[PDB]
Design a protein around this motif. Structure first.
Motif, PDB file in Angstrom:
ATOM      1  N   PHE A 136       0.837  -1.199   0.000  1.00 48.61           N
ATOM      2  CA  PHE A 136       0.000   0.000   0.000  1.00 48.61           C
ATOM      3  C   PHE A 136       0.870   1.247   0.000  1.00 48.61           C
ATOM      4  CE2 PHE A 136      -2.464   3.411   2.057  1.00 48.61           C
ATOM      5  CZ  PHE A 136      -3.489   3.504   1.114  1.00 48.61           C
ATOM      6  N   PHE A 138       3.720   1.929  -1.413  1.00 51.61           N
ATOM      7  CA  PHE A 138       4.155   2.332  -2.755  1.00 51.61           C
ATOM      8  C   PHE A 138       3.074   3.090  -3.522  1.00 51.61           C
ATOM      9  CE2 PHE A 138       6.647  -1.609  -2.081  1.00 51.61           C
ATOM     10  CZ  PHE A 138       7.923  -1.118  -2.291  1.00 51.61           C
ATOM     11  N   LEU A 139       1.815   2.666  -3.369  1.00 48.64           N
ATOM     12  CA  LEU A 139       0.690   3.319  -4.051  1.00 48.64           C
ATOM     13  C   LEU A 139       0.495   4.722  -3.501  1.00 48.64           C
ATOM     14  CD1 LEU A 139      -1.830   3.739  -5.740  1.00 48.64           C
ATOM     15  CD2 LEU A 139      -3.089   2.405  -4.083  1.00 48.64           C
ATOM     16  N   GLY A 142       3.092   6.934  -4.668  1.00 52.47           N
ATOM     17  CA  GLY A 142       2.817   7.406  -6.034  1.00 52.47           C
ATOM     18  C   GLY A 142       1.655   8.384  -6.114  1.00 52.47           C
ATOM     19  N   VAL A 143       0.609   8.119  -5.332  1.00 53.12           N
ATOM     20  CA  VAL A 143      -0.524   9.045  -5.130  1.00 53.12           C
ATOM     21  C   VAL A 143      -0.005  10.384  -4.605  1.00 53.12           C
ATOM     22  CG1 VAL A 143      -2.619   9.503  -3.751  1.00 53.12           C
ATOM     23  CG2 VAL A 143      -2.308   7.276  -4.849  1.00 53.12           C
ATOM     24  N   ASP A 145       3.298  11.577  -5.221  1.00 54.69           N
ATOM     25  CA  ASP A 145       3.978  12.150  -6.395  1.00 54.69           C
ATOM     26  C   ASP A 145       3.014  12.914  -7.285  1.00 54.69           C
ATOM     27  OD1 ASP A 145       6.034  12.253  -8.778  1.00 54.69           O
ATOM     28  OD2 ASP A 145       4.388  11.059  -9.618  1.00 54.69           O
ATOM     29  N   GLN A 146       1.990  12.227  -7.784  1.00 56.64           N
ATOM     30  CA  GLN A 146       1.077  12.797  -8.784  1.00 56.64           C
ATOM     31  C   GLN A 146       0.450  14.055  -8.237  1.00 56.64           C
ATOM     32  OE1 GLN A 146       0.382  11.470 -12.105  1.00 56.64           O
ATOM     33  NE2 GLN A 146       2.295  10.491 -11.421  1.00 56.64           N
ATOM     34  N   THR A 149       2.963  16.755  -8.172  1.00 53.83           N
ATOM     35  CA  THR A 149       3.251  17.347  -9.491  1.00 53.83           C
ATOM     36  C   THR A 149       2.062  18.156 -10.052  1.00 53.83           C
ATOM     37  OG1 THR A 149       2.713  15.282 -10.667  1.00 53.83           O
ATOM     38  CG2 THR A 149       5.031  15.641 -10.090  1.00 53.83           C
ATOM     39  N   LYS A 153       2.574  22.293 -10.912  1.00 59.28           N
ATOM     40  CA  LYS A 153       2.087  23.139 -12.010  1.00 59.28           C
ATOM     41  C   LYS A 153       1.205  24.276 -11.494  1.00 59.28           C
ATOM     42  CE  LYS A 153       2.057  19.194 -15.146  1.00 59.28           C
ATOM     43  NZ  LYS A 153       1.213  18.069 -15.640  1.00 59.28           N
ATOM     44  N   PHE A 250      -2.333  14.356   4.400  1.00 56.25           N
ATOM     45  CA  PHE A 250      -1.902  14.313   5.797  1.00 56.25           C
ATOM     46  C   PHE A 250      -0.466  13.818   5.991  1.00 56.25           C
ATOM     47  CE2 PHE A 250      -5.120  14.918   9.344  1.00 56.25           C
ATOM     48  CZ  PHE A 250      -5.940  15.741   8.592  1.00 56.25           C
ATOM     49  N   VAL A 253       1.384  17.066   5.277  1.00 50.00           N
ATOM     50  CA  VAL A 253       1.003  17.964   6.371  1.00 50.00           C
ATOM     51  C   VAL A 253       1.698  17.627   7.684  1.00 50.00           C
ATOM     52  CG1 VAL A 253      -0.920  18.468   7.970  1.00 50.00           C
ATOM     53  CG2 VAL A 253      -1.239  18.617   5.481  1.00 50.00           C
ATOM     54  N   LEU A 254       1.617  16.365   8.081  1.00 51.17           N
ATOM     55  CA  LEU A 254       2.319  15.902   9.272  1.00 51.17           C
ATOM     56  C   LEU A 254       3.811  16.088   9.080  1.00 51.17           C
ATOM     57  CD1 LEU A 254       0.072  12.834  10.109  1.00 51.17           C
ATOM     58  CD2 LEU A 254       0.264  14.824  11.517  1.00 51.17           C
TER      59      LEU A 254
ATOM     60  N   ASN B   6       6.138  12.303 -17.187  1.00 47.30           N
ATOM     61  CA  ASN B   6       4.875  12.338 -16.430  1.00 47.30           C
ATOM     62  C   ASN B   6       3.930  11.199 -16.820  1.00 47.30           C
ATOM     63  OD1 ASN B   6       5.459  14.745 -14.925  1.00 47.30           O
ATOM     64  ND2 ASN B   6       4.799  16.020 -16.655  1.00 47.30           N
ATOM     65  N   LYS B   9       5.338   8.091 -15.212  1.00 46.77           N
ATOM     66  CA  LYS B   9       4.950   8.065 -13.792  1.00 46.77           C
ATOM     67  C   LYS B   9       3.511   7.595 -13.558  1.00 46.77           C
ATOM     68  CE  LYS B   9       8.215  11.229 -11.619  1.00 46.77           C
ATOM     69  NZ  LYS B   9       8.393  12.289 -10.590  1.00 46.77           N
ATOM     70  N   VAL B  13       2.082   4.399 -11.282  1.00 43.98           N
ATOM     71  CA  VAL B  13       1.075   4.560 -10.202  1.00 43.98           C
ATOM     72  C   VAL B  13      -0.132   3.658 -10.428  1.00 43.98           C
ATOM     73  CG1 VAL B  13      -0.578   6.121  -9.064  1.00 43.98           C
ATOM     74  CG2 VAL B  13       1.723   6.953  -9.674  1.00 43.98           C
ATOM     75  N   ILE B  16       0.370  -0.260  -9.961  1.00 40.82           N
ATOM     76  CA  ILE B  16       0.429  -0.459  -8.511  1.00 40.82           C
ATOM     77  C   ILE B  16      -0.973  -0.334  -7.937  1.00 40.82           C
ATOM     78  CG2 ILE B  16       1.357   0.259  -6.288  1.00 40.82           C
ATOM     79  CD1 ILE B  16       3.326   2.058  -8.086  1.00 40.82           C
ATOM     80  N   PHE B  17      -1.700   0.676  -8.400  1.00 46.31           N
ATOM     81  CA  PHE B  17      -3.071   0.875  -7.965  1.00 46.31           C
ATOM     82  C   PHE B  17      -3.910  -0.376  -8.191  1.00 46.31           C
ATOM     83  CE2 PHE B  17      -7.418   1.908  -8.902  1.00 46.31           C
ATOM     84  CZ  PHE B  17      -7.794   2.633  -7.778  1.00 46.31           C
ATOM     85  N   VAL B  20      -2.967  -3.131  -5.983  1.00 50.62           N
ATOM     86  CA  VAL B  20      -3.552  -2.916  -4.654  1.00 50.62           C
ATOM     87  C   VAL B  20      -5.054  -3.177  -4.661  1.00 50.62           C
ATOM     88  CG1 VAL B  20      -4.112  -1.190  -2.861  1.00 50.62           C
ATOM     89  CG2 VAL B  20      -1.784  -1.409  -3.688  1.00 50.62           C
ATOM     90  N   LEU B 119      -2.013  16.100  15.907  1.00 49.32           N
ATOM     91  CA  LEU B 119      -1.261  16.824  14.880  1.00 49.32           C
ATOM     92  C   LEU B 119       0.125  17.291  15.316  1.00 49.32           C
ATOM     93  CD1 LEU B 119      -4.378  18.563  13.495  1.00 49.32           C
ATOM     94  CD2 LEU B 119      -2.694  17.481  12.018  1.00 49.32           C
ATOM     95  N   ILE B 122       2.049  13.367  16.916  1.00 51.57           N
ATOM     96  CA  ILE B 122       2.498  12.373  15.926  1.00 51.57           C
ATOM     97  C   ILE B 122       3.864  12.730  15.335  1.00 51.57           C
ATOM     98  CG2 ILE B 122       2.025  11.322  13.658  1.00 51.57           C
ATOM     99  CD1 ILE B 122      -0.971  11.467  14.500  1.00 51.57           C
ATOM    100  N   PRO B 123       4.016  13.939  14.776  1.00 48.58           N
ATOM    101  CA  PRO B 123       5.347  14.266  14.251  1.00 48.58           C
ATOM    102  C   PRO B 123       6.426  14.188  15.311  1.00 48.58           C
ATOM    103  CG  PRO B 123       3.743  15.823  13.431  1.00 48.58           C
ATOM    104  CD  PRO B 123       3.042  15.001  14.477  1.00 48.58           C
TER     105      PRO B 123
END
Ligand code: Q6F
Ligand code: Q6F
Ligand code: R16
Ligand code: R16
Ligand code: D12
Ligand code: D12
Ligand code: D10
Ligand code: OCT
Ligand code: OCT
Ligand code: OCT
Ligand code: OCT
Ligand code: LNK
Ligand code: LNK
Ligand code: LNK
Ligand code: K
Ligand code: K
Ligand code: K
Ligand code: K
Ligand code: K
Lengths: 281, 276
Positions: A136, A138-139, A142-143, A145-146, A149, A153, A250, A253-254, B6, B9, B13, B16-17, B20, B119, B122-123
């Motif tokens: 999970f 890795f997904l 990648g989620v 990354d996209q 990106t 832009k 998150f 954010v974290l 792109n 990439k 993704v 893998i998706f 999963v 918040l 955790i960090p």
């Protein structure tokens, strides 16, 4: 000098350890301040309900009444609706709700409203988790990354038009405001609204549920999809997607909050350095 | 060509998706295979207890039984749970993100604080667990210097001996952070051998269903126990973080291999079919 840096490291780990110990104590005392009152009021008034039905039916053996409740509360953890007026029931491990469960395992949210009872289910859950969690990752990576990106832009355009009579590292401040501002709309405000309407939770509960779930804490005191309401099933899939992208958000954010602390910590470390160095003139 | 990379990439993704998605479906069907049976047996035998309790005590009418259960379900949402210690424990479930949730905030203030506490907590916890990682890593780093000295002055030499080290990590590792603690849990809590290991894995992966919880029942606990578990969690979470990370890298490898094995299968299916 390899052990020279190792001594420095253990000194760092320890002060953080003590900071974290101290953080738990503060937290501990603020939670008990907050929750011990309502707990006491609810425990007095549940013994009020008890004595009303204890003596209103003496013909029940009366040591068996606390044993009845143990058979209900034990059976509530497997998830039951023991009533004469509704003895026909939905399933907790149907096609979908086992897909949902599998999701709680890999994301490590682990709500746990539904959890395995069978010795086999536990053994599979252990195998499913150890291979699932990394996968999970890795997904969700990648989620990341996209989505990164996309907003990459999005800041190229907004760091073009705000080039007025301009510093480099100060426009970084304006970008990270747009990340948090838009971000809290898409992955916190708007979904909590939908949850308020659909689930029928309070405004607070929704945002609480959002944060508790997307931090993967996953108490499971509230769960989207959990009751037998009606459900559009346009709904449930849209939540799967929300989770996929919310967890990504998150994570960043974290991670930001993490870096802010790094900074606050240097500052406060050298401010004590100052405080000592002046110490009254 | 910036959009050329792109498109590469998004192609990554997506596969893998789908992996999963497919992984959830397999899993979904194996869980329902496993749990739909026990659910049906437990639902028949809870309606057996229900109708048995009207007859074995006819003093109770059918209309007060449904009122009783409503007062139990009301009281299930509450349950001291928030004593000195159990609020320290709770705070721990928040920052580690285990989040068992046996104990959770009811007050509107407790929820609002829980959000703020999480918040920033955790960090923060992350850095400690990160440092707990390092140290524990450098401990076992000296531990493999000695064992890669006495075994590397004789039989079968380099590039295969990395395989033997990572077995020593997992073998010793599963003793210290899984076997030995589960034993203690079996004895102290009174869980089954399986339940302990299940609890170990469910907690150290930070899944934290909370179907089993160390400290959770109202038993005589030794003052020494609960703290020793806090320490276990601190170091266990570190360990599983690596272990999961290893498992992650194994998959990376298995994935190249299986990607080029399909590359082979195609390449012979080709120059066996050009052979007419
Ligand atoms: C108590 S129940 O099990 O019988 N009812 C259900 C409860 C929840 C869901 C569901 O999928 N909700 C969306 C969702 C998806 C993935 C993840 Cl990780 C989390 C969430 Cl909140 C489905 C059925
Ligand atoms: C209904 S109750 O909450 O009052 N019962 C308790 C349950 C657990 C504990 C506790 O301290 N367990 C050790 C521990 C520590 C930190 C973390 Cl994160 C996890 C764990 Cl398992 C205390 C009371
Ligand atoms: C960057 C300054 C620190 C605090 C920023 C808080 C903004 C995010 C909070 C999200 C909660 C939604 C608002 C409530 C609407 C009913
Ligand atoms: C209708 C009721 C709305 C209640 C809104 C209260 C939510 C406030 C959450 C606090 C935001 C924390 C930001 C700072 C964290 C670093
Ligand atoms: C193209 C990516 C292929 C990766 C598939 C890996 C499958 C892992 C299965 C684990 C076997 C227990
Ligand atoms: C749970 C799935 C086990 C592995 C299935 C094989 C993966 C197929 C995609 C590979 C294409 C490169
Ligand atoms: C019950 C509806 C759930 C369907 C799931 C569709 C998206 C899954 C992405 C992991
Ligand atoms: C939130 C309280 C933290 C206090 C830290 C003190 C470290 C010198
Ligand atoms: C209309 C776009 C939907 C936004 C994604 C989050 C939905 C819960
Ligand atoms: C298919 C091109 C990559 C960006 C697609 C985003 C679709 C939601
Ligand atoms: C090396 C063993 C320490 C943790 C075992 C005790 C936890 C129950
Ligand atoms: C006893 C059942 C084992 C499932 C993998
Ligand atoms: C509340 C933090 C204090 C650091 C010295
Ligand atoms: C009660 C906290 C002690 C941690 C070792
Ligand atoms: K419960
Ligand atoms: K959880
Ligand atoms: K939980
Ligand atoms: K988690
Ligand atoms: K969790």
């Amino acid at each position: 000098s390899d052990s020279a840096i190792n001594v420095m490291k253990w000194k760092t780990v320890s002060t953080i350890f003590l900071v974290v110990v101290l953080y738990l104590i503060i937290g501990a005392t603020v939670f008990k301040a907050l929750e011990q009152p309502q707990e006491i009021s609810q425990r007095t008034t549940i013994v009020i309900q008890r004595e009303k039905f204890l003596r209103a039916h003496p013909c029940v053996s009366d040591q068996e009444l606390d044993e009845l409740i143990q058979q209900i509360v034990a059976a509530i953890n497997a998830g039951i609706i023991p009533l004469g007026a509704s003895s026909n029931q939905v399933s907790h491990w149907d096609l979908g709700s086992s897909f949902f469960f599998a999701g709680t395992v890999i994301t490590t949210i682990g709500f746990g409203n539904i959890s395995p009872r069978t010795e086999g289910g536990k053994i599979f859950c252990i195998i499913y988790a150890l291979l699932g969690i990394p996968l999970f990752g890795f997904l969700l990576a990648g989620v990341g990354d996209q989505l990164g990106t996309i907003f990459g832009k999005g800041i190229a355009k907004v760091e073009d038009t705000f080039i007025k009579w301009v510093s480099q590292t100060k426009i970084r401040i304006i970008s990270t405001i747009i990340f948090i501002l838009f971000g809290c709309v898409l992955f916190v405000a708007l979904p909590a609204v939908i949850f308020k309407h659909i689930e029928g939770w309070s405004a607070l509960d929704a945002i609480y549920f959002v944060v508790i779930t997307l931090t993967t804490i996953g108490f499971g005191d509230y769960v989207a999809g959990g009751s037998d309401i009606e459900y559009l099933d346009f709904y449930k899939p849209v939540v799967w997607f929300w989770i996929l992208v919310g967890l990504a958000y998150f994570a960043a954010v974290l991670s930001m909050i993490g870096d802010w602390l790094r900074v606050i910590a240097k500052k406060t470390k050298e401010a004590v350095g100052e405080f000592r160095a002046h110490a009254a003139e």
